[PDB]
Design a protein around this nucleic acid. Structure first.
Ligand code: ZN
Lengths: 69, 49, 497, 49, 49, 72, 50, 288
DNA sequence: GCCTTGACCTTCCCCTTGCTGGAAGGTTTAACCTGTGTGCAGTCTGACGCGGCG
């Protein structure tokens, strides 16, 4: 289903945004979660560039920096 | 006195009336509602009403 | 049976959550029992402390005793205050004059000096030595207990036993964890000697192949028994009678302990009655009810039975004071101590009658007259009388937005004035470049620019050199250099800053 | 809504049935309410407030 | 234009020097949220790069 | 003794007595554990002496010396 | 600060232990005054314009 | 500013301490005219840091001149008032308590772990039914529910030889007791027998849950609260407006009452009073 | 521009009578009186979980 796919997500923060943040972060902090910051929203809240638009061209540089530390 | 003055001035029925035009007054007092206590709510309420 | 019915009810609590139900449906179990509950519980409590104070006497180890405390307080020639009022004081079944005390504190000395000699009369437990024990006791049993000071007399046992006991535990910590030992043999053998390690060979006579491996820790084991034995030398009496007196008065205090309980459970319903009579909405139900329970504790924990009244009323007003304080200490995040509180109370007690007999609100001067006290107090009272109003109140017509939006951060900066101040600084040091290096530098430091701290006249001097007044005249020099209506224009607008 | 006594008929909310749900209610100017109603499986039930 | 403080001040000072440049940081409402989670018994944190 | 009873017996008030004790003008009265200044018949007559001493004209100092006289 | 300190060391002007609370016209508004009303407690002196 | 990733886990008492600066000890805030924070109240600058930019409470230290320095009159350190935001507080408790989220959401995530109903656990912590810690004797078992009369019948049957209790510390020690590991491998293989719908699902979620606890490094011990953190003040302020009236982040109220009852408990702690009323106070805490 | 050089001022703390008034902070009274509640809340509701219960 649509909304359940929104909730049932790889990451948790955009999931933690808008619809029952409670259960999200409960089942997250028990689990030792960590998101790896490739969603848009994920880069919105920090205010960093999106991995996208104009910014994909730099986010790819960041991605090969993730490869090259 | 507490009860009565609270009603006459902090109920959501008393309002600062409309000093635009005469009809504004006469209609604003010739209003009817089903909001507030013993009443309804727009989200609770539907279309038939 | 209420537990019989609490059984079913708790079996089918309809997912109820309120501890009001829990506490009240629990304390409803035990009913009222008074009017001889009061007096028999009283006789039991006083019998508890009676057998305590009976136990207290005949003291071999608690050598510092009421005669000592009475000389310590009589060390500086005088006292008739409360700490004597606890002392011996035979009630004829209350300030104490010298001669009466000096008498009552004397035949006890006689019983001691005639008693301490027979302790060695063919043993601690001789017939006539025990006669002087029991007779010293009987000499005391006409008298009563003595004050909370006596607490430390009990402590002088515990802090010994706490130590002695601990050493045994310590010895066991050294004896019992590393190697194996028996627990049917160790007991009676340990009880056997109590003085020398003769139970060592007696226990090991079974030849106990683990007992052959008594090495590498014995230098600790025997040195932990050394601590117990040196405490035994310090005591000077081996312990079975001190244990007797201890558990005697220990049940003696537990007596009063558990006896005062059923008085706790006697009168809980008056407590809730009053708390709900005052839960006219000061704070909340339960905390009030609980302060009332402390109410009932201290009411019972001191009670005079001799008066012949009902316990409950004595208790009642004690409870009233406890809660009627605790309402007023707390119940505001602002602290307003009690004196202001009762001022406000009586103020309004007068205000109600001014409202009637005027039909109209009061005036500060009128109730100042009626109260006979001055204006500005009333002013600052009414300034202070009011309470805070909840950051997130709904100031909108609907939930439009609460009060938070309508608040200013009137604290931090103006970016305009920040940049303006940076510009002030820029222009100022630009000018300081334009004046003498000596004057400019020495004035940067004299006014504290270019560093953290501000030097002064003589200190700047004796850094530079000893001068005082030509330093002032150097200041005037720099003023003339700056006054100079060609360079002012970088600050002739900061004139207006 | 006035006081007195009102009736109504809900439209088979166990729409497995597609069946009527008659129910009746009183309303005072003050006090407690009362609700009478039929279940789908042919039995009366009642509830105050 | 909303939250970060160093940036807003710096850039004000800079465009007054005709500089159309940026120097970002991190917002404040974010760290607010961090504190308001850590209140709830939570070892939220951030990984170094 | 009861400190108010004593101050009314000597006519003074408690802070007067305390002021005088601050100035070391009498025998020291003890407290009680609750903190009540243990006055006395000794302090009774010391305070009555120190009372009439200044009404006569003896200051804090010479009236303290008069209570020294009595205590001598 | 040492620099405002410096300016008021140069010219030596001061501030009193009072400041202003002048009511003013909000921005952009302009107009005509046609009435004033003042209220004062019962007991305080009614001043000159009062 | 820069960083890689977000990281979440359960928090230890040790680390809630490590974050904090000093513990609070009383509920008050300020005077009613000399609007000045107290010691160990809620705005005490000692722990949270100073009040203005580098000024002490009395005015001893000022203007950055003594940077890493303290007015030990009050005991407030010379710093900016910028750290109103940051320096959280901490609190220690008498008896720990349970976090409502870790059960009272839908599925508990903690009682579920132990296959246990919610209602039993409710009856425990609102002090309605005892339970066995663990089976000392062979008669009775772990997770074995006890009502007080039944508790007692078992007691007079044995006396000392078992471990039974009502309250949370019971549950604390319980979840401390178990091991993820062997139960995980059990429920893994136990799947095989009846891998119908129900047995499979239940064993599934449990196995996954256990492994989650393992490999995250998280812990069941930390499920509940021997400690509590205090939020800094400016996030929860208490300030006047023009008319002379204060306004209060209502949170403040939610805090302050709690503290006082904690210390009330520490009063009664000196007494070994009837544990009934003590239970009343515990209930009151958990509710608050 | 280096030095005092003497001699004058202003401020700020601290001191000397004989107390007084104020603020904050404590502890006990014997006639008594024994299970709330107290105004909610008007039932929104469809999808979806899951507990018990067949
Ligand atoms: Zn300070």
């Amino acid at each position: 289903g649509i909304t359940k796919a929104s909730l049932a997500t790889e990451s948790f923060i955009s999931a933690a945004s808008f619809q029952e943040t409670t259960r999200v972060l409960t089942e997250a902090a028990v689990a030792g979660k960590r998101d790896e910051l490739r969603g848009l929203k994920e880069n919105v809240i920090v205010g960093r560039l999106i991995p996208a638009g104009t910014g994909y061209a730099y986010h790819q540089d960041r991605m090969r920096r993730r490869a090259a530390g | 006195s507490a009860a009565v003055k609270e009603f006459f001035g902090s109920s959501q029925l008393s309002q600062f009336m409309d000093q635009n035009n005469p009809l504004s007054e006469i209609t604003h007092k010739r209003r009817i509602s089903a909001l507030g206590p013993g009443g309804l709510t727009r989200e609770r309420a539907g279309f038939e009403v | 049976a209420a537990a019989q019915v609490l059984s079913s009810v708790e079996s089918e609590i309809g997912r109820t959550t309120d501890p009001v139900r829990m506490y009240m449906r629990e304390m409803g179990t035990v009913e009222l029992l008074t009017r001889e509950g009061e007096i028999d519980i009283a006789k039991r409590i006083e019998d508890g402390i009676n057998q305590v104070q009976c136990s207290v006497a005949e003291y071999p180890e608690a050598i510092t005793y009421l005669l000592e405390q009475y000389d310590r307080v009589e060390a500086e020639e005088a006292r008739l205050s409360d700490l004597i009022t606890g002392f011996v004081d035979p009630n004829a079944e209350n300030s104490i004059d010298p001669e009466l005390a000096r008498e009552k504190f004397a035949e006890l000395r006689a019983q001691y000096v005639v008693t301490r000699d027979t302790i060695k009369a063919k043993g601690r437990s001789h017939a006539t030595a025990q006669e002087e024990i029991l007779k010293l006791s009987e000499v005391f049993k006409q008298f009563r207990l003595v004050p909370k000071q006596f607490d430390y007399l009990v402590n002088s046992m515990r802090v010994m036993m706490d130590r002695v006991r601990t050493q045994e535990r310590l010895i066991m910590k050294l004896c019992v964890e590393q190697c194996k030992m028996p627990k049917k043999n160790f007991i009676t053998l340990f009880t056997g000697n109590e003085t020398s390690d003769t139970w060592f060979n007696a226990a090991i006579a079974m030849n106990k192949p683990w007992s052959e491996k008594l090495h590498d820790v014995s230098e600790e084991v025997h040195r932990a028994l050394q601590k117990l034995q040196q405490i035994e030398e310090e005591t000077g009496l081996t312990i079975e009678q001190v244990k007797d007196i201890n558990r005697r008065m220990s049940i003696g205090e537990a007596k009063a302990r558990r006896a005062k309980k059923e008085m706790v459970e006697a009168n809980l319903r008056l407590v809730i009655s009053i708390a709900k009579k005052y839960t006219n909405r000061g704070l909340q139900f339960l905390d009030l009810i609980q302060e009332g329970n402390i109410g009932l504790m201290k009411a019972v924990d001191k009670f005079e039975y001799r008066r012949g009244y009902k316990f409950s009323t004595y208790a009642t007003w004690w409870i009233r004071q406890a809660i009627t304080r605790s309402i007023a200490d707390q119940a505001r995040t602002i602290r307003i101590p009690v004196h202001m509180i009762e001022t406000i109370n009586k103020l309004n007690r007068i205000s109600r009658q001014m409202l009637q007999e005027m039909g109209r609100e009061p005036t500060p001067e009128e109730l100042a007259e009626r109260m006979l006290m001055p204006e500005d107090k009333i002013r600052k009272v009414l300034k202070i009388a009011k309470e805070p109003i909840s950051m997130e109140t709904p100031i909108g017509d609907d939930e439009d937005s609460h009060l938070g939006d309508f608040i200013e951060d009137t604290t931090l900066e103006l970016p305009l004035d920040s940049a303006t101040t940076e510009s002030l600084r820029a222009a100022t040091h630009d000018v300081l470049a334009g004046l003498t290096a000596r004057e400019a530098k020495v004035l940067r430091m004299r006014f504290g620019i270019d560093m953290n701290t501000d030097y002064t006249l003589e200190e700047v001097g004796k850094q530079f050199d000893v001068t005082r007044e030509r330093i002032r005249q150097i200041e005037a020099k720099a003023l003339r250099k700056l006054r100079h209506p060609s360079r002012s224009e970088v600050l002739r607008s900061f004139l207006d800053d | 809504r006035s006081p007195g006594v009102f009736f109504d008929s809900d439209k088979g909310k166990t729409h497995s049935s597609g069946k009527v749900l008659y129910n009746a209610r009183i309303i005072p100017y003050r006090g407690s309410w009362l609700d009478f109603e039929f279940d789908p499986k042919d039995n009366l039930f009642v509830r105050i407030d | 234009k909303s939250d970060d403080v160093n940036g807003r001040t710096k850039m004000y000072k800079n465009i007054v020097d005709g500089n159309h440049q940026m120097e970002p940081g991190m917002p404040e409402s974010f760290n607010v949220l961090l504190k308001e989670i850590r209140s709830l018994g939570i070892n939220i944190e951030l990984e170094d790069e | 003794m009861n400190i108010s009873d004593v101050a009314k017996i000597t006519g003074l008030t408690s802070k007067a007595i305390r002021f005088y004790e601050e100035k070391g003008l009498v025998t020291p009265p003890m407290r009680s554990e609750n903190g009540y200044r243990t006055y006395t018949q000794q302090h009774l007559n010391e305070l009555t002496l120190l009372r009439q001493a200044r009404q006569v004209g003896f200051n804090l100092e010479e009236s303290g010396e008069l209570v020294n006289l009595f205590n001598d | 600060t040492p620099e405002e300190k410096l300016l008021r060391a140069i010219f030596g002007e001061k501030a009193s232990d009072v400041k202003d609370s002048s009511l003013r016209v909000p921005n952009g508004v302009s107009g005509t005054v046609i009435d004033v009303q003042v209220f004062t407690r019962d007991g305080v002196e009614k001043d000159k314009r009062a | 500013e820069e960083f890689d990733a977000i990281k979440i886990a359960l928090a230890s008492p040790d680390m809630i301490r490590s974050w904090s600066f000093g513990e609070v000890k009383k509920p008050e805030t300020i005077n009613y005219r000399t609007f000045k924070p107290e010691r160990d109240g809620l705005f005490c600058a000692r722990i949270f840091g100073p009040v203005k930019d580098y000024e002490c409470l009395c005015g001893k230290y000022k203007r950055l001149k003594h940077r890493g320095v303290i007015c030990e009159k009050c005991g407030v350190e010379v710093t900016q008032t910028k750290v109103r935001r940051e320096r959280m507080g901490h609190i220690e408790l008498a008896s720990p308590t349970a976090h409502i989220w870790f059960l009272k959401s839908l599925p508990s995530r903690i009682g579920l772990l132990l296959d246990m109903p919610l209602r039993d656990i409710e009856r425990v912590l609102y002090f309605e039914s005892y339970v066995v810690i663990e089976g000392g004797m062979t008669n009775l078992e772990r997770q074995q529910i006890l009502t007080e009369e039944q508790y007692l019948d078992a007691l007079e049957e044995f006396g000392d030889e078992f471990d039974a209790k009502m309250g949370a510390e019971a549950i604390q020690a319980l979840l401390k007791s178990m091991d993820l590991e062997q139960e995980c491998e059990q429920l893994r293989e136990e799947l095989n027998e009846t891998n119908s719908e129900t047995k499979r699902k239940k064993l599934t979620k449990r196995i996954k849950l256990l492994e989650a606890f393992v490999q995250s490094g998280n812990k069941p011990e930390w499920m509940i609260l021997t400690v509590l953190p205090v939020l800094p003040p400016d996030l929860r302020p208490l300030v006047p407006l023009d008319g002379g009236r204060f306004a209060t982040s209502d949170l403040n109220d939610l805090y302050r009452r709690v503290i006082n009852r904690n210390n009330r408990l520490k009063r009664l702690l000196d007494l070994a009073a009837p544990d009934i009323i003590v239970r009343n106070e515990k209930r009151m805490l958990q509710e608050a």
